[PDB]
Amino acid sequence: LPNITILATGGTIAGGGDSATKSNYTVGKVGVENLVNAVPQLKDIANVKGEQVVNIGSQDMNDNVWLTLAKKINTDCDKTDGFVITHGVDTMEETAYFLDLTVKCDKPVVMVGAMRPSTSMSADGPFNLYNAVVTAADKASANRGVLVVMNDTVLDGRDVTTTNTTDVATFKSVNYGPLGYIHNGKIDYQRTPARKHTSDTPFDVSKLNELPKVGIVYNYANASDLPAKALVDAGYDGIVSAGVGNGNLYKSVFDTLATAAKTGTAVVRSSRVPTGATTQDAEVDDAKYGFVASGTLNPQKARVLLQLALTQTKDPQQIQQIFNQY
Amino acid sequence: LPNITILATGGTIAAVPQLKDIANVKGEQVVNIGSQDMNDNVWLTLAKKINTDCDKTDGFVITHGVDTMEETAYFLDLTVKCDKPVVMVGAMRPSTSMSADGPFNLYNAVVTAADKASANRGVLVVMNDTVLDGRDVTTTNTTDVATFKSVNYGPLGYIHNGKIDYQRTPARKHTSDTPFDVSKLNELPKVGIVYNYANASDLPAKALVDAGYDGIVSAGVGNGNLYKSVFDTLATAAKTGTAVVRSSRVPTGATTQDAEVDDAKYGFVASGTLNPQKARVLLQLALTQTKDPQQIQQIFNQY
Amino acid sequence: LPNITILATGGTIAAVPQLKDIANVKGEQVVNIGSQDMNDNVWLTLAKKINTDCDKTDGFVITHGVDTMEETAYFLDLTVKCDKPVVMVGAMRPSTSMSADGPFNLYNAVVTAADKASANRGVLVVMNDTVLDGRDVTTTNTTDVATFKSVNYGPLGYIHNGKIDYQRTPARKHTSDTPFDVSKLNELPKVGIVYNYANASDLPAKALVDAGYDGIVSAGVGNGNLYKSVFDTLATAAKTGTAVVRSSRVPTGATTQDAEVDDAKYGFVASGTLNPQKARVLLQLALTQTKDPQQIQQIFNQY
Amino acid sequence: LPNITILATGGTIAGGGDSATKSNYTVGKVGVENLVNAVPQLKDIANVKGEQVVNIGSQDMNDNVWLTLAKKINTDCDKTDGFVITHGVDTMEETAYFLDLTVKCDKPVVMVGAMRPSTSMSADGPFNLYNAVVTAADKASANRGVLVVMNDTVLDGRDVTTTNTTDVATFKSVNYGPLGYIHNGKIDYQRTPARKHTSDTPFDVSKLNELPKVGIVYNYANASDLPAKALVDAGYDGIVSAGVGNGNLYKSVFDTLATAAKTGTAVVRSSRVPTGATTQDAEVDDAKYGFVASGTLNPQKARVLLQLALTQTKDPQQIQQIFNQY
C-alpha cells in the first residue's frame, strides 16, 4: 500500500457547528487527526501521514501559505508516494492553479475539501477525503499536474472552479471537462490537461519569500475608477480586470488601466463571466494598449498566472505568450 | 397586429422584413453606446421613456449590448410601471457576420413583445429562442450564442414557430408591485463592487469608503465570504454609514445568512441569488428609500 | 408541529433523530421494491392511499428508488387530489456508505412536506437541497448525488437551514385541476416505448402493435424524428387504433409540431417537453378518457 | 492552402422550407454545391471539393451509409489534406462514433451539421460549415480521432451527443468536455480523447458488406418484455438495454436478456440517463449473467461499439475488455 501525506490547511472539511441540522459553522477549530479517524476505511488503500501546515478558512488563503505548500511539496517529494491537501472550498481553485504552476513533484498532488461542515448530516468530507486518497494513490494520477478531487470527480487545477455557493457538486472544469470519474475506488482517466504544468513551467518559488503585488478590479454599469486608481497609487506590479462579456471594460476603468500599462504595470483582461475565453482580436486593441488577454482563466486564476509571470518579465508580449502556454 | 416600439441602445446587434408579419414596428434610438459603457443616466432615461410612452404602445423591445444586459433588465424590472411586455434583445455575433444571431433574436423578441401572455411577467430578456426573466438571467459564456440563462430558477418559456408555451413566472415582486419610483430622480446612490480572492487588497474597498459611497457590494468567495483585510474594512464601513451587501463571485446559488458571517453583528445584507452587479441594482434602489441594514435586507428578501 | 406521513417504497435509501425537531413522523411501508421494478399497481396503490389518507395528515413524503422516481412523481402529480405537500425522496448512495445522502435528503423532504408554502405546487421531488416539480424533474447522471434536475424549466426553490425561498410554481395543470380520477381503476392502458437510432429495427414497434397495445411512445432522434421502418410501422399503428406519441431520446427540449413530421396526416401526438417515460405516463391516463389523437394532443398541451 | 474534401449525406444544413420564419422544413432536396456557394469566404482557408455520397435525413442513417463513408475516407485518404462530413443532427453522434472506430485516415475527419434549415433566418449551417473547414484544415486536428464541429466547439466523436431538440448549442461532450474552442478561425486545443480511436483500433470494415444485427430496448416502469423477445426470436447477434439509473432493467426485460446471453446473444447494459457511466459492481452481477457494462457510452453509442465488437468475438469477457479500451 502506498505512502500518502495529507497537508491540512483547514477549510469546511475541518469545520464545526453546535448543530448537525443548522447551517451555522466556523473553521480552524478541528485537527487533521480528527479527519483521518472519521475515515477509518483509509487504512485499506494507504499509509496516511497527517501534517497541519495552517488551520484557516480559505477565504483567508494568502501568498505566504502558497509559498509554504509548494516549498514543502517540492522538499518532501521523494519521502512519500503522493499528497492530498485538505483545503477550503472558497479559493481551492486559486491554490490548485498556483501549485499546478509551482510543484516539481510529478507524483500525484490532489486537493480535497467539503461543502458541509464535518458535524453536519450527510457530511461530504469523509467520502471526499477517501476519494482524494484513491486518486493520490493511483499511479495513473501522476503527470496530470495538480488535481482537485470533489464529488466522485478528478478535476485539473487549471480549469476547475466553484460553480455554486452551497452545492456538494459545485466543483467543475466548466471549460474543458473533468479528467476522470471515481467509482468504487477506481478511476477511468480519459483526459490530461494540454497546457504546461508542474516541471514543464519555468516558475521557481524555491527562493521567493514574496510574490509580485496583483489586484483584481470588477467591471459593471457605471463602474467607479477609484479601485483601479487605488491599486496604481500603491504602485501595483499588475492588475487583472474582471471585464464584462468578452473581457470588456467600462470607459473610466479602461482609461486608468491604459495609463498604468504605459507607466509599466501589467494589465490582464479577464471576465466576470463564468465560462469561455477573454479573446484577443475582439472589441479591444491589446497590442495598442500593452494589455494581455486572459483566455479561459477567470480573474482570480489570471492573478495567479500574472503574479508568477511578473517574477520572470514585465514585458506585455512575453506575458501574453506565458498566458498562451500555461 | 400589435403596435410594438423598439428602443435602440446600441451593442453587438446594431432590415428584418418579416417583422411586418407580426407587428407595426416603430423604432427610436435612445442612445448608441457599447453596453460596457452602460450607466445610471441611460437607465433613468429608459425607465422614464417607457413609463411615459406605455399608453401609446401595446409592448416594448430594447436592443442592448450583451455585456450589461442582465444589469439593465433587472433595473428596468424594478423601476418600470408598464405591465405590458418589455423585452430586451441583443446578439453575440455582429450583423456583418456569417449566421448573425441578431435577425432571428429581434424577430423572436417582437414575437414575445406581441404575445398578450407575456404581460405581467416583469421585464424579459429574449435570446436564443428563450424567454428569460430580468432578475435571474445572466450571461454564462464570453462568445457562445446560447450564453443567456436563468442559472438558478430557469427560463419562463421557449419560443418555437413564433409561439410561446409559458410554464413559469417570477415570484419575486417586479414592475408595478415595487415601491421604486424613479420618475423624479436624476441620479442613483453611488454603489461600488469589490472582488474577493486570495491575499485580496483592502485598497479597492477603502477607496470606496473614502469617496463616501452610499453602498458597497462584496463579490465574496464561496458563500459570500470575505478575505480578512476586506472583512475589516467593510465591518468598519457598515457603521461609517456605508451599506454593505455580501454577494458571490460564484455564478450560481444564493449568498445565505446563518453560514460563517454573523450579518446582524456587522449590519451586512446577504444578496441571496443576486450576483454582485444585480445586487448593486437592488442596493442602489433600496438606498433611495432607507439606509437601514435591517430594512435593506427586507428588500433583498422581497425583490 | 405538523403530522407528516412517510410512504416507504424501497430503493437506495431504505434513525434520523432530528425529524422530531420539525414533525410528528408516522411511517408505513406500501411495498419494498427496487424502483427498476416499479409498476402500474404500485402507482394505483400510492394514488389511492394518498387520496384516502389526505384529511388524516398535514403532508406526505414518499421514499422511492431513484431509477423511476421521475415516472412515479408525474403519475402521482396527475392522479393525486390532495393539494397538501406530497414529496418524493430517494438517495444515490446506500445508507451503509460514507457520507450517505439519504439522511439529509429525508430531513429536507420532511422540511418540504411541513412547509405550508409547499401546498398547491403539485407532487414535488426533493433531492440535493432542491425542491423540483414532478413534471420537469428527471435524473441526469447515473451516480452523481446532484443527479435530479428540472432540465427544461428549472427548480421551484432551494432549501437552506430548513427554510425554502420559493420563486416558481409549475403552470401545467396538476393534482385536483386534472380530470384523471384513478380511484375506481385496477389497471391502466398498455403503453410501450420504442427507441430510435440508425438502422432501427421495426420489430419492437411491431411486437407492441401485435399485443394490441393502447399506446406507443417513440423515443425519436433529434426533434422526435423516426427511422423509416419505425415511421412505416407506427404510421400503420396510429389507424389500427393504437395511439402514437412522438417524444425524444434527447434529454432536454420539446418534441414540437411543424418540424419534419406532419402529425395530423398520421394521427401522431407531439409529447412537448415530456421525455418518453413521462409521455407514457400522460398517454396511459389520456387513454382512460379518449382514443382521439386530436383530444390526446389537447391533453399533451395542458398537463 | 490545404485541400479539403466535403462528403455530403444531407441533414438540416442541406434542408429547406417555403418560409424563413416558419419552423416547417424537409431534407434531401439541396446539393453540396449550394452549401459551398452559400459560404463564399471558404476560398480564404481551403481548396474545397464537394462529393454527394447520399442525400437523406440522418433519422434515416443506416449501416450501409456507415460502411460507404469509412471505405471512402480510408480509400481517398492520401488524395486530400482533410475531410468535413455534412450530416443531420439526429444520429450525428452515432456516425461520428462509428467513423471514430473505423477510419484509418489520421488526417482530420470533421462532422458538421445545423439545427436551423438553410432557408431560415440566422441559419447556423454557414458559420458551422466554415468552422468545420478551419478545424479540418488545422494540422493540430490530426490524430484526435473523428470530430464533430458545432457552435464554435470541437467535440470528440466518442463523448459528443445532442442534448436539446431545437437549440443551435445542442452538441456537447457531456462527460469529458470539448477538445478545443474556435475563435476567429483559430483553435486552442487543450484535450485529446485517451480511449483508443482510428488506426489504434482492430476494427477493419474494408471487406464487410454487412454489420452484425444489434437492437436497442428501452427500460421504464411496467416495461413490456415484447421488444426484448421480438429481437431474440429474430436471432439478433446483440442487444443493448437502455437501462434506468445505473443501467438497471425492469424484471421482465432482465429475465429475457438473461436467457439470450446464455443462448449466446451479446447483451450490453447502458442507460437512458443522459450523462455518467453504467458501472460494473453496482446492483447487477455482470459476470454471473454474461452481461457487459457500457461505461460512458449511451445506448445508441454502445450499439456502435457492440456491432463492431461482434465482428471479432461473441465472448462476453473480451467484449467487456473492448468496452474498457474503445
From Swiss-Prot, chains A, D:
* Hydrolase keyword on record: yes
Q: What induces it?
A: By cAMP and anaerobiosis.
Gene Ontology CC: one annotated term:
protein-containing complex
The Asparaginase/glutaminase domain is annotated at 2-326
* UniProt enzyme class: hydrolase
What keywords tag this UniProt record?
A: Disulfide bond, Hydrolase, Periplasm, Pharmaceutical, Signal
Q: Which PANTHER family match?
A: 60 KDA LYSOPHOSPHOLIPASE (PTHR11707:SF28), L-ASPARAGINASE (PTHR11707)
Q: Outline the subunit composition.
A: Homotetramer.
Q: Which family does it belong to?
A: Belongs to the asparaginase 1 family.
User: What's the protein called, per UniProt?
Assistant: L-asparaginase 2
> Source gene?
ansB
